[PDB]
Structures are given as C-alpha cells and as structure tokens.
C-alpha cells in the first residue's frame, strides 16, 4: 500500500495517488495555499504545510480523514518528520523561524529562528539534525533537534531551495536555484565539499533509497528535465525532459519511480527509474507542489470505492431517442455521478437517458465513499436506424 501525497496548492486539497496505478484515488480539502504534504516514517500519518493559514493539517492514511489543524509560524512550506514520528518540524518562510510540533499533543512545542525565508529541511538518519536552506539568505542552517538551536551556518549558494540527506547520513544535496549550482555538504564537519555547476535552477531534490543516485529537477523556459546525479563522482549522469515549472520531487521507495509535480500543468509525472523515460502524467489538484517525503507505504489501506457499470446496449450502438438503462456495478459506492458527454448528468444510482441528436458520446461514471473516488468510462454510438454501425 504505497502512496502519494499532492498538495494543490490553489485548490486547498491533497490528491492522494496510488503509485502502483498510478491513480488518483482521492481529494482531502485542507488548509488554504497547501504547499507540502509529508508522511511519517511508519506511513501512518500525514502532515501539510497550509502557507496562507499559517497551520498544518494532520492526516490519518487509514481515513484519509483529517483529524487535527496545528497552528504553525507565518507562511508554512515544508514540513519533515522525525524517524520516531514524536516530532513535526515545518520552515515558515514569512517569519523565518521553525516550528517543532509535538505529535503526543498535536501542538507547538518549540519555535527556532532560522536564516531569512527558509523553505527547505531535510532531517539526518538519525533524527539528530535538521537543515533548513535559507532561501533569501544563501545558507543552510543546521539545527540541534534535540536543544532546538542553529549549531552552525553553512554558507551556500544564492536561493537555496530543495535539499535533502543521503540514506547513510553522510552528505546533504542543496539546489541553489538561482546560482545554477548544487552544494554537497559533509555531515561530519557541516563543511561544503563540493559545488556541481548545473544548466539549468536546481529546484527540488530527492536520492533515491540506495544512496547511488539523486534527481533534481531545473527550471528552464521549454528546456526544463529531470536531472541524476551520481553520489559517487557528483557529476550529472543523465537529464529527462519534463513539463513547465518542475519543483518537488520525489522517488518511491522501491526505487522505480519517480514523481515529478508539474505546478503550472496541474498534474504529475511519473518517470521509471530503469529507463529514464516518462511512463505517465496524470492530472491532480490546481497549481500542484510536493516537497520531501510525500510518497510511502501506508499499514492500512481506505476502503475505496470500485467504479464499474454496464447498460442495455447491446449492438454497441443504440438508435436516437431509445432510452439507455444504465446499471451501477460499482463496489463500496455511496455517491454517484453520471456524465452522459452530452451536457447532462445524473446523481442517481442507476439512471437512464435518452440521447436528442445522433453521435458518440463518452459516458463516465464516478463513484465516491467516505475515503475517495473512482471512475468508469464508456463509449456510447447513438445512430439513426438504418445507418451504418461501430466497428
């Protein structure tokens, strides 16, 4: 039971995406300008950075339900978790500080201040320290999870954005957007080792669960890709074209996938890992970001609704004006919705319908629970009689 988690951004919601399917299998409404969705490490909850109401929205992956709004700093962005899911750490980019929020009480129990604008964080293996890029300072400040203070600032490039720590905790990637370069920091001295000029704004980024490769993704008017990074030589081994305003990124944990939010497109792109290529693109909520840890396996999965219907249709035709019978099949639906693709719809189970003009109609249904959606297609020939049939 492996999952994604999308927040769009200007439709105040989440779409939770099953990465087997690569469906969407249900909308969360949250809080407003949602800008990152995170889950814990055991996949039992999920939590998102609201950055117009200053909270966070906790959701719980067995009910897609959400179950609490923690109150978090000025303009919330992203959120990590610690390794024993007791601690829910959010940068507010408005306020340059950061929340530490307790997940026993489900309230703020700590407020650090942070470099200016800080956007990105990402947590060592060990839940020890935290590093936070300061956007609108060129820095990193690297945070004592346990005194809650800035133990040290690592100066970076300009407009740091994404980061992220490799598996065996000994670097940290860091996408300087507008410096077209990526900072490798040392964990051991907080010292950059390294600087990987890039040809494009390193945005977001993510490495994969072994540790030997790290995708990035670069901004570029018409030449924007999805870029590797060997962990090994620090150098760019490959680059994938993708779609406009690539931001955050992430891979599955089986290392297959590769899930790229397209904010400008209002969907998300999938890219096989084995091939470089894109495998999918599927539309999501409005103006779509997902930073960090936004994909993994959840113990319990939602009952979700199962889509399916047939009709009376028979000659996989049906002449004009004869009503069409169309019989719900769908499992574990309590909600309906029928669009006939000619204009008109129903909210009944097992509505009928007759078609006022010959022509092919593509009918879909939509079922809906509790915990999400479904959808079913059919193509419908409405023809005169005596004229000629479908194939």
């Not at 055991?42 to 992956?61: L, Q």
């Not at 309230?107 to 650090?112: D, I, K, L, N, Y």
């Not at 993704?217 to 030449?223: A, G, P």
Request: proline share 6%; with cysteine; charged share 15%.
């Amino acid at each position: 039971s492996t999952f994604a988690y999308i927040a769009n951004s200007e439709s105040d919601n989440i779409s939770v995406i099953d990465v087997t399917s690569n469906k969407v299998t249900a909308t969360i409404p949250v809080g407003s300008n949602p800008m990152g969705a995170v889950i814990s490490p055991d996949g039992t909850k999920v939590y998102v950075a609201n950055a117009h109401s200053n909270d966070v929205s906790i959701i719980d992956t067995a009910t897609n339900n959400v179950i609490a709004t923690v109150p978090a700093g000025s303009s919330p962005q992203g959120v990590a978790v610690s390794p024993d899911g007791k601690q829910v750490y959010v940068t507010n980019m408005a306020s340059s500080t950061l929340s530490v929020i307790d997940t026993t009480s489900n309230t703020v129990a700590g407020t650090v201040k942070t470099g200016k604008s800080p956007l990105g964080l990402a947590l060592s293996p060990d839940g020890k320290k935290l590093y936070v890029t300061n956007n609108g300072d060129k820095t990193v400040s690297v945070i004592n999870t346990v005194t809650k203070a800035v133990i040290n600032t690592v100066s970076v490039g300009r407009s740091p954005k994404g980061i992220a720590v490799t598996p065996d905790g000994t670097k940290v990637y860091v996408a300087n957007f507008d410096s077209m370069s990526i900072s490798v920091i040392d964990t051991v001295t907080n010292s950059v080792i390294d600087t990987v000029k890039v040809e494009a704004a390193p945005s977001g980024i993510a490495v994969n669960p072994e540790g030997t490769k790290a995708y990035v993704t670069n901004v570029d008017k018409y030449f924007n890709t999805v870029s590797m990074i060997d962990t090994g030589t620090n150098k760019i081994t490959a680059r994938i074209p993708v779609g406009p305003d690539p931001a955050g990124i992430a891979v599955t944990p089986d290392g297959k996938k590769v899930y790229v939010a397209l904010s400008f497109c209002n969907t998300v792109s999938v890219i096989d890992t084995a091939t470089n290529t894109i495998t999918a693109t599927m539309a999501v909520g409005k103006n779509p970001y997902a930073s960090g840890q936004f994909i993994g396996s959840i113990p319990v999965q939602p009952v979700y609704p199962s889509a399916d219907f047939k009709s009376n249709i028979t000659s996989g035709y049906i002449f004009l004006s004869e009503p069409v019978q169309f019989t719900d099949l769908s499992k574990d639906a309590t909600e309906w919705k029928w669009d006939f693709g000619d204009g008109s719809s129903s909210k009944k189970q097992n509505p009928t319908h007759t078609y006022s003009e010959t022509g092919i109609y593509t009918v879909r249904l939509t079922v809906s629970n509790s915990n999400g959606t479904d959808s079913q297609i059919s193509t419908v020939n409405v023809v005169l009689k005596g004229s000629p049939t479908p194939s």
